[PDB]
């Protein structure tokens, strides 16, 4: 049985967190697959490197250790939704973030509580590549449990995330996240009139989830 411990993010975790996020997203992420070609592994690591110091300073993020091997198997990256760094993104990931803001912005700024320390934004999650399905499932349950604990302990009102894969969408639902938007990703229109995810099947959704704590 997999037994785990959540440790707050520290400055020396940078490369381990990057390796997990890159391995967890590059050529796997459900939105970026439609921007091919031109999704580079360094596009993800460039973003994390720009935000790394503030990410650690805000003290809302954590890694998950396997306490039997003392190695990191997962990580949850969080910010206050109203107090997030903005990075100029020179990569094609900028369209993903603009799409996510298209989903989140209207809901966040007009329907969720105003002020800082209200909305805990679950920004990225990931698990190590070598985890088998039992370990992956267990680590995701452990990270969801721990995001809730951080939210309560840090006195946030709730947890806000856009879930873009079927697994994270279904996990959100069994953890009783409320659906605020279920958007068909192939209908999103970029500023140049194109549809960057237009080739995606009609069934691929971006679901904006919210859970009060
Ligand atoms: N949490 C938003 C899902 C996502 C996709 N790509 C990057 N992030
Ligand atoms: Ca999520």
Automatic annotation (TrEMBL):
Signal peptide: none annotated. This is Ebony. It comes from Drosophila melanogaster. The gene is e. The chain holds residues 666 to 877 of 879 of the full protein.
